[PDB]
Every structure is written in C-alpha cells, then in structure tokens.
Amino acid sequence: DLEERVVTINRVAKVVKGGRRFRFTALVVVGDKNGHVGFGTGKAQEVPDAIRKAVEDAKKNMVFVPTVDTTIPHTVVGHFGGGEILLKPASAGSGVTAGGPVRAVLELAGVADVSSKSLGSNTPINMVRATIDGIKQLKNAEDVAKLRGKTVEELL
Amino acid sequence: RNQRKVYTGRVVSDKMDKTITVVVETYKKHGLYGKRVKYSKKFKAHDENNIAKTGDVVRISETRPLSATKHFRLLEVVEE
Amino acid sequence: AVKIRLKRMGSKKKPFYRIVVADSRFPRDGRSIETIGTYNPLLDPVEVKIDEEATLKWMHNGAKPSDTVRNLLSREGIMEKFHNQKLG
Amino acid sequence: ARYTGPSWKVSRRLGISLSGTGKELERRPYAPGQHGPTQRKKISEYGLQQAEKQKLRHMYGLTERQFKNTFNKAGKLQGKHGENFMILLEQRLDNIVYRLGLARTRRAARQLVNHGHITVDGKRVDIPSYQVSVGQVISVREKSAKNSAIAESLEVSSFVPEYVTFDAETLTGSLNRLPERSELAAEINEAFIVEFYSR
Amino acid sequence: VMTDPIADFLTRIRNANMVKHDKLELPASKIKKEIAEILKREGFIRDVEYIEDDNAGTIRVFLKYGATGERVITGLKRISKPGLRVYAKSTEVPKVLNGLGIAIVSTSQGVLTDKEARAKQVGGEVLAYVW
Amino acid sequence: PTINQLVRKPRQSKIKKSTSPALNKGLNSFKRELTDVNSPQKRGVCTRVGTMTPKKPNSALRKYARVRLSNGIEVTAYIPGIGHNLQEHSVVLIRGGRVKDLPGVRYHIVRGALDTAGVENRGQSRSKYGTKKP
RNA sequence: GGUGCAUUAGCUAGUUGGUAGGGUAAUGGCCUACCAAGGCAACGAUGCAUAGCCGACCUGAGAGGGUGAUCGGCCACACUGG
RNA sequence: CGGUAUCUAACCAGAAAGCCACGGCUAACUACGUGCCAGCAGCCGCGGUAAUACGUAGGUGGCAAGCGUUGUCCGGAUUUAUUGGGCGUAAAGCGCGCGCAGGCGGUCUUUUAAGUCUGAUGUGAAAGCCCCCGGCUUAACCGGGGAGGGUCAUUGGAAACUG
Ligand SMILES: [Mg+2]
Ligand SMILES: [Mg+2]
Ligand SMILES: [Mg+2]
Ligand SMILES: [Mg+2]
Ligand SMILES: [Mg+2]
Ligand SMILES: [Mg+2]
Ligand SMILES: [Mg+2]
Ligand SMILES: [Mg+2]
Ligand SMILES: [Mg+2]
Ligand SMILES: [Mg+2]
Ligand SMILES: [Mg+2]
Ligand SMILES: [Mg+2]
Ligand SMILES: [Mg+2]
Ligand SMILES: [Mg+2]
Ligand SMILES: [Mg+2]
Ligand SMILES: [Mg+2]
Ligand SMILES: [Mg+2]
Ligand SMILES: [Mg+2]
Ligand SMILES: [Mg+2]
Ligand SMILES: [Mg+2]
Ligand SMILES: [Mg+2]
Ligand SMILES: [Mg+2]
Ligand SMILES: [Mg+2]
Ligand SMILES: [Mg+2]
Ligand SMILES: [Mg+2]
Ligand SMILES: [Mg+2]
Ligand SMILES: [Mg+2]
Ligand SMILES: [Mg+2]
Ligand SMILES: [Mg+2]
Ligand SMILES: [Mg+2]
Ligand SMILES: [Mg+2]
Ligand SMILES: [Mg+2]
Ligand SMILES: [Mg+2]
Ligand SMILES: [Mg+2]
Ligand SMILES: [Mg+2]
Ligand SMILES: [Mg+2]
Ligand SMILES: [Mg+2]
C-alpha cells in the first residue's frame, strides 16, 4: 500500500479545423515512507482519469533511496535538461527544506531531514527528473567499502 | 638593541648625487580571487661614495629621514 | 597625575563600579590604563575584588587612591603592605 | 487571559479537542462560520504548516511574539529543535499549575498564577511565563488556601503526569525531572513547526 | 602546449572510465608515481606497473570495476590549477564526499591523503579530489 | 573569464533606478541647489485639478491633480476614494505609489493629512482614505 | 589596508639631490645662498566628483552587499579669513 | 530622587480592543446596491442590469495596544556567477596577421628558503555577537569568566609543491 500525491494538473490543447480540443495532464509522485518512491505522467479528457493513468505509470519508475540516520549519506547534484537540484544532508530535527515538487519526492521517500536548492528552471516535470538524477548518485558507506575492498571502520 | 628594517632590491637610476633609486619587487595575493600579483614600489637610498651602479642588486636599511624623500641607506652591493 | 578611581556602570538606580587606573584629565567613563577590580555597593555586605598586586605596583609609581578607594583598600588591607614595603 | 474570546470554536477550527475532549466532538465537529456545515476545500502546503503552529499557540494559550521568542531560545540547546520546543514550553508556570490539578483549564491556571495565589520556594510569583526548574517546590502560601474554586478543581483532576509530584494536603508541587517528548501531546507534528519558521 | 601534466593524469583516467577500458599507459613522472601509488592503497586502481625507457619511462594503470561492471572511480577533479594555486592550513583540509572520498595533499612531509594529513597537523597544496 | 582576465578588470554590477525621483530630493533656498535626501512624504500646492481617461481596455474617468512640490518639481498625483474636496491653490500631502492605468501618474495623494479631507461614509478599510471612526 | 570617472594623459620648479648656514624640544628644502637637472606616472601621476576614520550595525547558509545615528578611541572645526 | 520602589486591609466584573485582508500568489465567502459608471490594483488583471476582485452588511482569517501605507538597505537574484554563468541558431569570438610589456610553462639531480605548512613570544583596548555561571518576583536589562577576530612584528623548525 503506497501513498499518492498529485503535484501539478495542467490543461493542454491542440488546434483542429473547427476549434481547439483540450486535455488534462497530471504528474503524480508515489511511494511508501520506507525508502521507495516513483513518479508518473497521465493524460485524459477528465482530471480524475488523468490521475488514474499517472498512478499506474508511476508504479513503473520505482527507485530506492539510501539514507543514514534519516538523512542522505552525502551531497549530490542532480541534472536533467534545464533543471538541476542540489541535495545536502542536514542535522537531525531540522526537517525537509525543499521547493514545490521536490518536497514530494523526499517526504514520500521517507527522508526526514534534508536541505535542497533548485538552481535551474522551474518546470515541475524537469524538477522531478533532476531530483531522481541525484538519488542515482547516492551511495551508502557499506557498499563503498565493498567496491574499494576496504572495511567500514577503515573508510571513516 | 632594537633593529631597523632591511630590504633588498635592484638599482634603477643613479643620475642624482649621493643617492640611488631601488625598486623592490614583492608578492601579494588579490583580495577576492586569491592570485599572487607582482607589486613594485621604488625607494630612495643614500649612496655614500657613489659605489652602486645602475642595474646592481643591493641591500638597504631604514634610517632617520636624510632628506625630503630619502629615509633608507645603502648597506651591501650583492651583485653587479 | 594618574590615580585609581571608580567607574560607574550599570542601570538606572542600580550602580556597579569597576576600579580602574586612569589620568585625572580623561572622562569618567572613557580612557583608562588598566582595570584592577570591581565594587558592588548595593549588596548589604559590600563585596569587593582587588588584584592586591597591580595596586601595589602602581602606588610605587605615583598613583593615589581617591576618597572611596582608600576606604576599600584599607578595609581589604593592603595599605598596611604599602606601609611596610615603603620603610622596609 | 490574553485571548478572552470563546474558547470553543478554536478547537472546532483546528479540529483537535483541546483540554481533553468535548469541545470539538459531541456538538458540531465541523468548522465555525456560515460555511461550516458544507463547502469543504483542500489544504495547500502553506496551510498544513500554518495549521500546526496554531495548535501549539492556542493549546498553551500564548501570544505570537512570545511564541517566536521562546522558539528561538529553544533551538539554542543541544538536540532536536522541535522536541526541545515542547519541553521548554512545558516548563512554564501556567502549565505546571494546570498539570498539578489546582485549576481546571489553562485559563483558570493562568489567572490563579496572575492573582498572586501561588508561591515557588516560598516567594510570591506573578509572572505566568516563569520557567520552572527541577526540584523547586510550588505551594499556595495560605491566604486563599481553602478556596472553593481551587478545592473544587482538585477533585476533578483525572490523573497526574509522572514528571510532576503533588499531594493534596500541603499542595507542594514539584518537577521530578525534565519531561520527554513522547509523553507530551503526541497529536502535533513538531517537524512542521520548524519548517514553518524556516521559510 | 603542455601546461599541466598532472591534469592529464586526472583526465586520462576519467576518459578511460567512460568506455570501460581495462588499462591505460601514459608518460611517467616522479609526482605521478605517488598519485598513482596512492590510488592503489585505497583500491581505486587494481594495479600499477612501471616501464623503463629512454625518455622518461612509462607507467600503465589497471582500472578496477566491480562485479557486473560498476565503476569504482566515479569522478576526478583538479583543484590547484597553474592559473590559481590553492593552499590549505591544517584545519582547512576538506572531506571529499563526507569521508567517502579522498583528497591528495602535497604536504611538507610528502604527498599523502587528507585523512593522514589531519593526523599530523600539516597543510599543503590540495591536488585532486577522487570519489 | 580566466582569473587573470578577472583581475585586470573586475566585475562591475548593475545599478538600480528609483521609481520615485521627486520624493527623494531636497532643496536649499540659500544656495538654490537641490540636495539629495530621502523622504517618505512631501507636500505642495496643487495648480490644476481634472481628469483623463485610462489606457485600453479600461474606460473610466480618473481624477488627478497637478502639484508643485516644496522642492520645486512639478508632478502629477492621483486622488483615491469616492469624491474629494480639492480645488486649485490647495495644499496636499503626496506619497509614493504608481497607478498602472494612467500614463504619467506616479504618486498618490494621502487623504486626511492636510487641506484634503477624508472620504465620506467609509465603513471599512478606514485607515486608508482617512475617515475617522463613526 | 580600506572610492567613482580615461568621454580626465601627462604633472612638477623649492620641484629632485648635493655643499654651508639659519631655525626647532627634535631629523628633515622646514628656510636661505650656491651647484647640477632632476623627481612622479598606464602597478593609473594629475584633474573633477563624493566622503570624517575605526571598534561596530543591518542583512545573508556562507563568501559578500549596504551603513558609520546612539556607546567607546582618534581627527578637524568654534560667525568668515589672517 | 522621595514617602519613590516595595507590603497588607477592604469594595468593585465593574473604567480598559482596535487594525488590516477573504479570485491566485496567500490563511480566510455568502447576501444586497451599482451596471466599462462609481470605482479597485504589487503582478495577472476585475467592473458592459445574477461581481467570492467595486461600496455596505453578516461570517471568517491574521496580529494585538496595536495594525496598515510610504521611503531606504540586504535577501530571494546563479540577475557581475572566486564560492557560483556563459558566447553555432536566444545578448555575446575582434576580418586577419607580426609581435614589446604581462600571464602560463617538458624530464631528472644537488642546493637555497621568497611563496607554502608548523611551534613559541608580543599585540589585535573597553563595550557589542557567541559559550558557561549569577542578580533584578520572569524577561528585556545588568555583572563575572572565556572564546573568536590579523595576507601583524620577533624568533625556531619541514623541504613535497611554485620560485
Ligand atoms: Mg550598605
Ligand atoms: Mg481595498
Ligand atoms: Mg595609503
Ligand atoms: Mg644641513
Ligand atoms: Mg617641500
Ligand atoms: Mg589624485
Ligand atoms: Mg544568497
Ligand atoms: Mg561579514
Ligand atoms: Mg545629533
Ligand atoms: Mg551659526
Ligand atoms: Mg504613604
Ligand atoms: Mg503583601
Ligand atoms: Mg469581588
Ligand atoms: Mg486559499
Ligand atoms: Mg449584483
Ligand atoms: Mg483580492
Ligand atoms: Mg468587496
Ligand atoms: Mg464586516
Ligand atoms: Mg476578528
Ligand atoms: Mg507586547
Ligand atoms: Mg510599524
Ligand atoms: Mg516599503
Ligand atoms: Mg548575488
Ligand atoms: Mg546566463
Ligand atoms: Mg570558447
Ligand atoms: Mg537573429
Ligand atoms: Mg546573435
Ligand atoms: Mg573568425
Ligand atoms: Mg615574455
Ligand atoms: Mg615545472
Ligand atoms: Mg616565469
Ligand atoms: Mg575586544
Ligand atoms: Mg537568573
Ligand atoms: Mg551585557
Ligand atoms: Mg563579557
Ligand atoms: Mg627538493
Ligand atoms: Mg634546508
């Protein structure tokens, strides 16, 4: 059982001879607070039907976020097109400090204390892409030692 | 005994009597960017017997004002 | 003539004095040479903390306590030492 | 009593039953106003953060400016900022009197402290915002003593928290130790309070 | 012309990582020896060998990848460029990626990593960030 | 640019421009020279009262004034509220604020500060328009 | 060590150094006679415009940006010139 | 100062609540009047006989002895980008060359110690920010101790890197 959060609902149009036909596009972030999160996109003639398509789509982009002490292991920078996101660990109890669409991908992912800053564009779809582009770079300390052949206490 | 300050530079002009002009080259990092830059300001030294010649490398020590502008005296002539 | 004197600081009707060494010419709350101690008059047993070493050093260089200071130093008891080191 | 208005709608608007239960439920549990029964609407991120502030402010019943000041000095300690905020507020003399059972509500407790009816360490104190430490004794100092209002509220006191000690013969209350976050309110999201003040 | 031979060492490793090349070789130098030797100490590179020739010798480095082809080195950066040299005091030595990476510092006691520098209270020139 | 280029000539930032030039200027009658001091309000005597029409697509009739400020600058102000009592040769207080519809109007006349009086029968938002408690 | 303008390129003649003397609490073109022609400047002289300087204050994640009222230190001024 | 601060004795719920917003940004919506008029406005922009945007009511929301507007400064502004931007088509590579000054510079050994790192001494006043205690019934406020703050001066070391 996952949680839903509608980010943006936008009305788009294509021009056809007689006039204009309008459609609704919805962007939805889905995940459980344990560390899994994903996003999707839908399109329909009605707002309720656009969400349902986006929920099913979002269940195909699930990603895992590694966290230590309810905080990301280190500092990463996302990048996707014209949008980029800076994610930074923060002290316990500070809470999430994030912009509009980047809060959803962090509160749903279960991260409790993290600081961020959007250095790029403002488009909601490119902020979600640029954020997940940062979670990919995120590594745990346990796995780093495994690649480097060291042990955890030797690293730190 | 308290000690005055001694510098080291390169002679530039000897067209005046009893004195020489010495340029001292020094480094100083830029305030905001942090890059070392050349900085040269020339002094006046007292040449007691016109020993130093143009282009020499000398050492000069600080003294009481000998004139309107001179307040250094020549000490050594390291190179010619 | 450098002399040691009080310096008024604190709040309205709540004075607190800081024993300082300064010239007579300078303002009451201005330049000073150095600070020796404090003085609280509001405490019913008046409490004072003094260096007992910088005072004796200064009083052999031409420093004179004022009217209130002399009472403080006598009660604390270093003018006796100023007596004894003078003749000895 | 800084806010003298009806203390019944604030529970209905906030949605949490302040002072136990009954203010919100039983009666109309929806928000006050003309458009209470119908016309519901969604809440944005600003609304959710702002609504959390209003619960703490109106639960302990103190003004905005103090709330900001006590928040700032709460975060100067060592530990989690949100948890230290409720611990610091729990220290107030109003709350301790409320916790001991000498008053029924916080408004009653605040007036009781205000009109010099209590004493700490045998000295009269009239500041509601006085921060009680651990080990200090709080009493009544006779005078009012056997007062009908104070004696009536003693009977209707339900239970007493474990971090306060009080016996109803000398009325000598005391704070056993500094309280814990888990045993305070438990219906507030302190993470939203700290996020509200960082925008 | 060639103005920064150390930058070439840093960028040749990066260029070979993208295409998953299993080895590379490049002209040798004394300073490159420690940098290459340091990387072998923390497992960033799988091996290193020296080839002796007329001009300056030659060094080849064997890159390291995890099982199922994950990069071990995910980035290399030059800090103290010839155009703007940087120096760090004893307490100013950084922590690359919150201790999960390393920084190479050319102290007065030799070329050694950031972790070792803070154990001897010495500073120097920060050369590279490897994470 | 390169660090050496950035040292030979450093970075010069842009300069903002004030939108209320007349409010932040003074005058010295002894020297007949404008002095540079900021000020939140200025007073002056109005020389002409009238109306013009706003830009498209608005179509109302906006009531303005033409005031000569105490420092000797001729500006155009705007009277808010329903109905006024301004006439030529009247002393009024102006304060900052630009009206979008009007082309050249850049200031607002405050109501209730001087010869200009408050608005009649104002029940709410009374701090503006200067109407006292009824 | 802390400001704008190159749509402000040359500035200076007791100016630059020397010899003897005068004067001052004290060194010194500080002043005088003689002798020589030097000195500064694209690392910004000169000129125009603006400004008391600092500890500090406001803001800012920080690096920085703006200010220099009150309190403390230094300076200059006392209707305008000598 | 001054019969000032401060105590105890009694009577009174009695003398003590306003300011701004409610289309979005931004927490909070319904009636009536007007009918591109009166008017509103920081931006998008609302008003042309069913206006949650104009005016007034009822209700609500933010603060409270206040609350709003104006003026000035920093932030958001990575919108002068050292930290932290760019120049094919969006603003942005001189039409091209020869070259003084300046900036940068292949590999190794020995030495030096200007740059670089480090220890000691002197100093960077007091007040202010920050940390730890204490007094005013609490706080503001006031004391005691400490910390920080320099391309600073003298002196002793290290030799990898630049010179
Ligand atoms: Mg006494
Ligand atoms: Mg209005
Ligand atoms: Mg200077
Ligand atoms: Mg002479
Ligand atoms: Mg002269
Ligand atoms: Mg000049
Ligand atoms: Mg910033
Ligand atoms: Mg600063
Ligand atoms: Mg004044
Ligand atoms: Mg006069
Ligand atoms: Mg009396
Ligand atoms: Mg009493
Ligand atoms: Mg009564
Ligand atoms: Mg809303
Ligand atoms: Mg209508
Ligand atoms: Mg509105
Ligand atoms: Mg209205
Ligand atoms: Mg109303
Ligand atoms: Mg109200
Ligand atoms: Mg108040
Ligand atoms: Mg105000
Ligand atoms: Mg303003
Ligand atoms: Mg900026
Ligand atoms: Mg750009
Ligand atoms: Mg290019
Ligand atoms: Mg074009
Ligand atoms: Mg173009
Ligand atoms: Mg070309
Ligand atoms: Mg050259
Ligand atoms: Mg070299
Ligand atoms: Mg060179
Ligand atoms: Mg100090
Ligand atoms: Mg205390
Ligand atoms: Mg203090
Ligand atoms: Mg102190
Ligand atoms: Mg060597
Ligand atoms: Mg050596």
Coordinates of C-alpha atoms in Angstrom, one line a residue, chain A:
Chain A
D1 CA 0.0 0.0 0.0
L2 CA 1.6 3.2 -1.3
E3 CA 0.8 6.9 -0.9
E4 CA -0.3 9.3 -3.7
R5 CA 0.5 13.0 -4.1
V6 CA -0.7 15.0 -7.1
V7 CA 1.9 17.6 -8.0
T8 CA 0.5 19.5 -11.0
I9 CA -2.6 19.4 -13.2
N10 CA -2.3 21.3 -16.4
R11 CA -4.7 21.8 -19.3
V12 CA -3.2 21.5 -22.8
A13 CA -4.7 21.9 -26.3
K14 CA -4.2 21.0 -29.9
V15 CA -5.8 23.1 -32.7
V16 CA -8.1 21.3 -35.2
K17 CA -10.0 23.0 -38.0
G18 CA -13.2 23.6 -36.1
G19 CA -11.5 24.9 -33.0
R20 CA -9.5 23.6 -30.0
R21 CA -9.7 20.4 -28.1
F22 CA -8.4 20.4 -24.5
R23 CA -6.8 17.7 -22.5
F24 CA -5.6 17.4 -18.9
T25 CA -2.1 16.2 -18.0
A26 CA -1.3 15.1 -14.4
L27 CA 2.0 14.5 -12.6
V28 CA 1.9 12.2 -9.6
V29 CA 4.6 11.1 -7.1
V30 CA 4.0 7.7 -5.5
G31 CA 5.9 5.9 -2.8
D32 CA 6.0 4.5 0.7
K33 CA 7.9 6.2 3.5
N34 CA 10.2 3.2 3.9
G35 CA 12.5 4.3 1.1
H36 CA 10.8 3.6 -2.3
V37 CA 9.5 6.4 -4.5
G38 CA 8.4 6.9 -8.1
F39 CA 6.7 9.3 -10.4
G40 CA 4.4 9.1 -13.4
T41 CA 2.5 11.0 -16.1
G42 CA -1.0 10.7 -17.4
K43 CA -3.3 12.3 -20.0
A44 CA -7.1 12.2 -20.4
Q45 CA -10.2 14.3 -21.1
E46 CA -11.0 14.5 -17.4
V47 CA -8.9 15.3 -14.3
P48 CA -9.9 12.2 -12.3
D49 CA -9.0 9.9 -15.2
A50 CA -5.6 11.6 -15.7
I51 CA -4.6 10.8 -12.1
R52 CA -5.5 7.1 -12.6
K53 CA -3.3 6.8 -15.6
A54 CA -0.5 8.6 -13.8
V55 CA -0.7 6.4 -10.8
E56 CA -0.3 3.3 -13.0
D57 CA 2.6 4.9 -14.8
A58 CA 4.3 5.9 -11.6
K59 CA 4.4 2.3 -10.5
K60 CA 6.9 1.5 -13.3
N61 CA 9.6 4.0 -12.3
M62 CA 10.2 2.9 -8.7
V63 CA 13.6 3.8 -7.3
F64 CA 15.3 3.1 -4.0
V65 CA 16.9 5.9 -1.9
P66 CA 19.6 5.1 0.6
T67 CA 19.6 7.0 3.8
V68 CA 21.6 7.0 7.1
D69 CA 20.2 8.4 10.3
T70 CA 17.1 9.7 8.4
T71 CA 19.4 11.7 6.2
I72 CA 21.1 11.2 2.8
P73 CA 24.7 10.0 3.1
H74 CA 26.4 12.9 1.4
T75 CA 26.0 15.9 -1.1
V76 CA 24.8 15.2 -4.6
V77 CA 23.7 17.4 -7.6
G78 CA 21.0 16.3 -10.0
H79 CA 20.9 17.4 -13.6
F80 CA 18.3 16.8 -16.3
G81 CA 17.8 19.2 -19.1
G82 CA 17.2 22.7 -18.0
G83 CA 16.6 21.8 -14.3
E84 CA 19.1 20.8 -11.7
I85 CA 18.7 20.2 -7.9
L86 CA 21.3 20.4 -5.1
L87 CA 20.7 18.0 -2.2
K88 CA 22.5 18.4 1.1
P89 CA 22.4 16.4 4.4
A90 CA 21.2 18.3 7.4
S91 CA 21.2 17.9 11.2
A92 CA 18.6 15.8 12.9
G93 CA 15.3 17.6 13.7
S94 CA 15.7 20.3 11.0
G95 CA 13.2 18.8 8.6
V96 CA 13.0 18.9 4.8
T97 CA 13.8 22.3 3.3
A98 CA 12.8 22.0 -0.3
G99 CA 10.9 23.6 -3.2
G100 CA 7.5 22.7 -4.5
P101 CA 7.7 19.4 -6.5
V102 CA 11.0 18.3 -4.8
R103 CA 9.3 18.1 -1.4
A104 CA 7.0 15.3 -2.7
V105 CA 9.9 13.0 -3.8
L106 CA 11.5 13.5 -0.4
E107 CA 8.6 13.3 2.1
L108 CA 7.2 10.2 0.2
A109 CA 10.6 8.6 0.1
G110 CA 10.8 8.8 3.9
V111 CA 13.7 11.2 4.2
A112 CA 13.2 13.2 7.4
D113 CA 16.0 15.9 7.4
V114 CA 17.5 17.2 4.2
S115 CA 18.2 20.6 2.6
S116 CA 17.9 21.4 -1.0
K117 CA 18.0 24.2 -3.5
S118 CA 16.7 24.4 -7.1
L119 CA 19.5 26.1 -9.2
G120 CA 17.8 25.5 -12.6
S121 CA 14.5 26.0 -14.3
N122 CA 11.0 25.9 -12.7
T123 CA 9.1 23.3 -14.7
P124 CA 7.6 20.7 -12.4
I125 CA 8.4 17.7 -14.6
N126 CA 12.0 18.7 -15.0
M127 CA 12.5 19.2 -11.3
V128 CA 11.2 15.6 -10.6
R129 CA 13.6 14.3 -13.3
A130 CA 16.5 16.3 -12.0
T131 CA 15.9 15.1 -8.4
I132 CA 15.8 11.4 -9.3
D133 CA 19.0 12.1 -11.2
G134 CA 20.6 12.9 -7.9
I135 CA 19.3 9.9 -6.0
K136 CA 21.0 7.7 -8.5
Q137 CA 24.4 9.2 -7.5
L138 CA 23.6 8.4 -3.8
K139 CA 25.7 5.6 -2.3
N140 CA 25.9 4.0 1.2
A141 CA 29.1 3.7 3.2
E142 CA 28.7 -0.1 3.4
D143 CA 28.6 -0.5 -0.4
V144 CA 31.6 1.8 -1.0
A145 CA 33.9 -0.3 1.1
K146 CA 32.8 -3.4 -0.8
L147 CA 33.9 -1.9 -4.1
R148 CA 37.1 -0.4 -2.7
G149 CA 38.0 -3.6 -0.9
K150 CA 38.2 -1.8 2.5
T151 CA 36.1 -2.3 5.6
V152 CA 33.6 0.2 7.1
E153 CA 35.7 1.3 10.0
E154 CA 38.8 1.8 7.8
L155 CA 36.9 4.1 5.5
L156 CA 35.6 6.5 8.1

